[PDB]
Scaffold this active site. Structure first.
Site, PDB file in Angstrom:
ATOM      1  N   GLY A  10     -54.720   0.973-104.785  1.00 59.20           N
ATOM      2  CA  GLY A  10     -55.502   0.011-105.557  1.00 59.20           C
ATOM      3  C   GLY A  10     -55.667  -1.296-104.808  1.00 59.20           C
ATOM      4  N   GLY A  11     -55.470  -2.405-105.514  1.00 56.04           N
ATOM      5  CA  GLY A  11     -55.516  -3.701-104.859  1.00 56.04           C
ATOM      6  C   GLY A  11     -54.537  -3.837-103.712  1.00 56.04           C
ATOM      7  N   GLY A  50     -77.926   0.617 -71.524  1.00 60.75           N
ATOM      8  CA  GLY A  50     -77.591  -0.279 -72.613  1.00 60.75           C
ATOM      9  C   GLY A  50     -76.096  -0.451 -72.798  1.00 60.75           C
ATOM     10  CB  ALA A  51     -73.226   1.877 -72.479  1.00 61.29           C
TER      11      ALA A  51
HETATM   12  C1  LIG Z   1     -54.554   1.295-112.259  1.00 61.43           C
HETATM   13  C2  LIG Z   1     -55.418   0.210-111.424  1.00 61.43           C
HETATM   14  C3  LIG Z   1     -55.404  -1.162-112.234  1.00 61.43           C
HETATM   15  C4  LIG Z   1     -54.699  -0.026-110.102  1.00 61.43           C
HETATM   16  C5  LIG Z   1     -55.464  -1.066-109.292  1.00 61.43           C
HETATM   17  O1  LIG Z   1     -54.863  -1.921-108.665  1.00 61.43           O
HETATM   18  C6  LIG Z   1     -56.974  -0.992-109.274  1.00 61.43           C
HETATM   19  C7  LIG Z   1     -57.681  -1.813-108.165  1.00 61.43           C
HETATM   20  C8  LIG Z   1     -57.536  -3.180-108.147  1.00 61.43           C
HETATM   21  C9  LIG Z   1     -58.115  -3.936-107.142  1.00 61.43           C
HETATM   22  C10 LIG Z   1     -58.855  -3.301-106.130  1.00 61.43           C
HETATM   23  O2  LIG Z   1     -59.398  -4.131-105.126  1.00 61.43           O
HETATM   24  C11 LIG Z   1     -60.730  -3.820-104.689  1.00 61.43           C
HETATM   25  N1  LIG Z   1     -61.531  -2.747-105.108  1.00 61.43           N
HETATM   26  C12 LIG Z   1     -62.812  -2.775-104.433  1.00 61.43           C
HETATM   27  C13 LIG Z   1     -63.828  -1.802-104.671  1.00 61.43           C
HETATM   28  C14 LIG Z   1     -65.016  -1.893-103.988  1.00 61.43           C
HETATM   29  C15 LIG Z   1     -65.213  -2.926-103.101  1.00 61.43           C
HETATM   30 CL1  LIG Z   1     -66.755  -3.026-102.253  1.00 61.43          CL
HETATM   31  C16 LIG Z   1     -64.195  -3.901-102.852  1.00 61.43           C
HETATM   32  C17 LIG Z   1     -62.998  -3.803-103.541  1.00 61.43           C
HETATM   33  S1  LIG Z   1     -61.561  -4.712-103.567  1.00 61.43           S
HETATM   34  C18 LIG Z   1     -58.984  -1.920-106.132  1.00 61.43           C
HETATM   35  C19 LIG Z   1     -58.398  -1.157-107.147  1.00 61.43           C
HETATM   36  C20 LIG Z   1     -57.691  -0.098-110.251  1.00 61.43           C
HETATM   37  O3  LIG Z   1     -59.076  -0.005-110.217  1.00 61.43           O
HETATM   38  C21 LIG Z   1     -56.878   0.704-111.277  1.00 61.43           C
HETATM   39  C1  LIG Z   2     -84.504   4.083 -69.517  1.00 60.20           C
HETATM   40  C2  LIG Z   2     -83.699   3.354 -70.726  1.00 60.20           C
HETATM   41  C3  LIG Z   2     -83.716   4.256 -72.040  1.00 60.20           C
HETATM   42  C4  LIG Z   2     -82.248   3.123 -70.297  1.00 60.20           C
HETATM   43  C5  LIG Z   2     -81.455   2.340 -71.352  1.00 60.20           C
HETATM   44  O1  LIG Z   2     -80.266   2.563 -71.590  1.00 60.20           O
HETATM   45  C6  LIG Z   2     -82.200   1.283 -72.110  1.00 60.20           C
HETATM   46  C7  LIG Z   2     -81.439   0.337 -73.040  1.00 60.20           C
HETATM   47  C8  LIG Z   2     -81.336  -0.988 -72.695  1.00 60.20           C
HETATM   48  C9  LIG Z   2     -80.651  -1.846 -73.548  1.00 60.20           C
HETATM   49  C10 LIG Z   2     -80.055  -1.351 -74.722  1.00 60.20           C
HETATM   50  O2  LIG Z   2     -79.366  -2.259 -75.549  1.00 60.20           O
HETATM   51  C11 LIG Z   2     -78.087  -1.827 -76.034  1.00 60.20           C
HETATM   52  N1  LIG Z   2     -77.548  -0.551 -75.848  1.00 60.20           N
HETATM   53  C12 LIG Z   2     -76.252  -0.436 -76.483  1.00 60.20           C
HETATM   54  C13 LIG Z   2     -75.502   0.773 -76.440  1.00 60.20           C
HETATM   55  C14 LIG Z   2     -74.286   0.801 -77.065  1.00 60.20           C
HETATM   56  C15 LIG Z   2     -73.830  -0.317 -77.708  1.00 60.20           C
HETATM   57 CL1  LIG Z   2     -72.270  -0.258 -78.491  1.00 60.20          CL
HETATM   58  C16 LIG Z   2     -74.574  -1.526 -77.758  1.00 60.20           C
HETATM   59  C17 LIG Z   2     -75.797  -1.557 -77.131  1.00 60.20           C
HETATM   60  S1  LIG Z   2     -77.004  -2.740 -76.929  1.00 60.20           S
HETATM   61  C18 LIG Z   2     -80.196  -0.016 -75.063  1.00 60.20           C
HETATM   62  C19 LIG Z   2     -80.881   0.846 -74.220  1.00 60.20           C
HETATM   63  C20 LIG Z   2     -83.683   1.151 -71.983  1.00 60.20           C
HETATM   64  O3  LIG Z   2     -84.335   0.175 -72.694  1.00 60.20           O
HETATM   65  C21 LIG Z   2     -84.469   2.071 -71.056  1.00 60.20           C
END
Ligand SMILES: CC1(C)CC(=O)C(c2ccc(Oc3nc4ccc(Cl)cc4s3)cc2)=C(O)C1
Ligand SMILES: CC1(C)CC(=O)C(c2ccc(Oc3nc4ccc(Cl)cc4s3)cc2)=C(O)C1
Lengths: 424, 426
Positions: free
Chosen positions: B125-126, B326-327
């Site tokens: 939960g929380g 790009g990598a």
């Molecule tokens: C028996 C219980 C009271 C036990 C318990 O503690 C909880 C609980 C309390 C707080 C929580 O905290 C967050 N839940 C979300 C969900 C979605 C997103 Cl987007 C962000 C958050 S943060 C999660 C579960 C229950 O529902 C049932």
């Molecule tokens: C002949 C090509 C297809 C070769 C090539 O690779 C690219 C290219 C250049 C910049 C890019 O920019 C980023 N790539 C990544 C990949 C991983 C992550 Cl974790 C972050 C980023 S950001 C992406 C592709 C081309 O335009 C021409």
């Protein structure tokens, strides 16, 4: 004239007669210009799909970087029009490096000037990541990559229209107008279904809150559809809206919807855009192979986004808000500016009969099986006399005020107007 | 339930005899204390598994918030020991609100003091979301977090969990200084750890541990999540550093959605606390999900560009074998203002492998060749293309590599660049 021509494309985007080129037209594959969008001084650049399919090279990348520096210097919005297969392979590493310098300029601009992307042709490689670094991506259909595109236009000209309106949303934010808010009040509760256990599309609620004449620019409508986010105007002022959509996945938070909401909160916080948060969420869902890791890490991101947010952000509970998801949907514990509830709204940990089945599990298990269900319903009915309901939430202090649904617009606007531009 | 007693768990974690309660004991389900960890003043709190399963209520959540406020005022690290089924359902919405206020305090502390979570039992939960808000989560095996990637470090048992938690406090709060003498004394021929064939895969972790100090653990984060990317904390001539390294053993070392996210989150964490980065690069491309879904690697890859681009701690890059496309840009390239870019003498920096490149640039000439000659022609075009492109010499002329180095001086060349950099900017 070819439809892909970059001067033609810039001229379609900008106010007629406003275009001023920032450099001599050339074979670089990019044209960059200054112009206006409904009066606002704007910088734009366009990849040249007639030259090497728009492939990005050293000299075109330098035009983009120069345009970014011009726009940063004058604090103008910057719009990229994208049609490009990526880096020019033949220019080698020099082109990779120059593409990276484009990325670094967008990063320097991030949160400082608005960055709009209009993708009007095929966009690959470095030209897919460029738009991914900006704040809003508009895609013309003629141009899987789920989540990346914010707005699908109808065609190329419609994409420039939506791009132009986004410049207005970010750069002509306006003031709240209390008298315009009142003039638009309606009974928004009337749009809910009669049974509180039936599902509905939340979008009519959202458009009833927002100004009748202004479009609701929904972001990422087809990605994570249990969450609705987008930009609009409330009494003339740009606001961001987040709303659980009961129509999909029961309106529950899950990993994708938490991420959609968190990203949108961060964008609005960055540009001083206040938030309206329409809450009707019954819980949160796990993955597919039931892995909780995604909703836990992305849910934490949502918590982080609201907790750190400093723009005004007001919550309106329409029907339900349960458990951990109640906390995440801009609750008082995360410093929501104000929390409103409609009269029939329930604010609880969970349903009454689910809650009773835990709190009284031993009493219930110790009862004769032929009279257990009648005791479960009796304890549930007593549980609702004390838990849930707005006045319990009001007494606790997690709701600030129960409001007449006919006054939703003016109540939301009043709360947003009274908060500071920053801090919460 | 003696072994789960909070005072004992707190006492097993803190230096012997340093524990000083921050409030008087009760049955709130939380005990919070000040202490020392190898001398560093540290705040900690323990959920009380001997009271209602450690379930969180208003009173216990209040002890946690006061523990965070204390730690924030003194800028002390704060360690949570977690064993809890969640919020106390009988306190209703009031307990939800108090759990939220715990989240809110963790968010105020975010990037300001280090936050370490030691999950020693069930956390649900929380009490699952609490740890997820902190910087490093250590998990003992007799434990599970429920309502991957959430757990950074898996310990051998509860006592080991405290030992690893204690080392993390040292890594964040006793970062030390670079020592040129100790860096050079540790120099070895790192290149010898590679295979002889540039096409064979290998585990990058021996290269990493050979760069880091021989006497110090490498605390790898999330080893079993996104295995194409290795990240973690260790020491470089006594100084805390963070390491990012493509691992060619998994997915050819390619970047993908979760490896980009692993790297991005780890970069922002080091940058928040002044921890310099070593980026060991050997990456041939990037990948979509199994469904051919690219939206993850685009979105998370952009977040990795952002994390390196905004990063201001010293961050040095080492190209071992190859870095492509790009990598290449994303792995702390000159274009994102890397502090210094190093390469081993045979490393490749190119848009793509030469065979792939000329296969595109000369598709028509190759398709026109006779089938039994179209291969000799491919190798002739590829060797002509890498005469002029892809090598370290050409990368030095361009300016995307700063120095070609003798691999026998890897460890001391990296140290020199990080030590002489400004503590902030880049
Ligand atoms: C028996 C219980 C009271 C036990 C318990 O503690 C909880 C609980 C309390 C707080 C929580 O905290 C967050 N839940 C979300 C969900 C979605 C997103 Cl987007 C962000 C958050 S943060 C999660 C579960 C229950 O529902 C049932
Ligand atoms: C002949 C090509 C297809 C070769 C090539 O690779 C690219 C290219 C250049 C910049 C890019 O920019 C980023 N790539 C990544 C990949 C991983 C992550 Cl974790 C972050 C980023 S950001 C992406 C592709 C081309 O335009 C021409």
């Amino acid at each position: 004239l070819d439809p892909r021509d970059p001067l033609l494309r810039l001229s379609n985007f900008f106010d007629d007669g406003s275009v001023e080129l920032l450099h001599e037209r050339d074979r670089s594959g990019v044209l960059a210009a200054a112009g206006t969008v409904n009066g606002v001084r704007t910088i734009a650049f366009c990849t040249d799909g007639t030259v090497m399919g728009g492939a990005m090279g050293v000299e075109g990348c330098t035009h983009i970087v120069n345009a970014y520096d011009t726009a940063i210097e004058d604090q103008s919005p910057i719009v990229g029009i994208w049609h490009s297969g990526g880096a020019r392979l033949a220019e080698g590493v020099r082109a990779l490096h120059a593409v990276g310098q484009v990325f670094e300029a967008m990063i320097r601009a991030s949160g400082y000037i608005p960055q709009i992307s209009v993708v009007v042709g095929f966009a690959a490689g470095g030209a897919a990541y460029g738009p991914a670094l900006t704040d809003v991506v508009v895609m013309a259909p003629e141009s899987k990559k789920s989540g990346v595109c914010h707005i699908v236009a109808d065609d190329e000209l419609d994409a420039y229209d939506r791009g132009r309106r986004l410049v207005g949303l970010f750069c002509q934010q306006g003031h709240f107008d209390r008298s315009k808010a009142e003039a638009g009040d309606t009974d928004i509760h009337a749009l809910l279904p009669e049974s509180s256990r039936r599902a509905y599309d939340v979008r009519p609620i959202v458009t009833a809150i927002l100004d009748a004449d202004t479009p609701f620019d929904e972001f990422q409508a087809n990605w994570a559809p249990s969450m609705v986010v987008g930009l609009g105007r409330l009494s003339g002022r740009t606001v961001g809206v987040l709303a659980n959509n009961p129509l999909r996945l029961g309106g529950c938070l899950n990993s994708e919807s938490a991420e959609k909401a968190a990203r949108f909160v961060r964008l609005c916080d960055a540009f001083g855009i206040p938030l309206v948060v329409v809450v009707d969420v019954p819980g949160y869902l796990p993955g597919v192979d039931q892995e909780w890791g995604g909703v836990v890490r992305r849910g934490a991101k949502l918590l982080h986004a609201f907790g750190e947010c400093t723009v005004p952000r007001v919550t309106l509970v329409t029907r339900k808000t349960y458990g951990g998801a109640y906390i995440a949907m801009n609750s008082r514990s995360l410093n929501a500016t104000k929390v409103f509830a409609w009269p029939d709204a329930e604010v609880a940990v969970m349903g009454a009969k689910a809650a009773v089945g835990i709190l009284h599990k031993k009493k219930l298990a110790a009862a004769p099986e032929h009279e257990r269900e009648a005791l479960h319903d009796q304890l549930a009915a007593e549980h609702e006399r004390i838990a849930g309901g707005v006045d319990s939430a009001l007494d606790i202090g997690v709701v600030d005020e129960k409001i007449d649904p006919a006054h939703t617009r003016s109540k939301l606007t009043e709360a947003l107007a009274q908060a500071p531009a920053r801090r919460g």
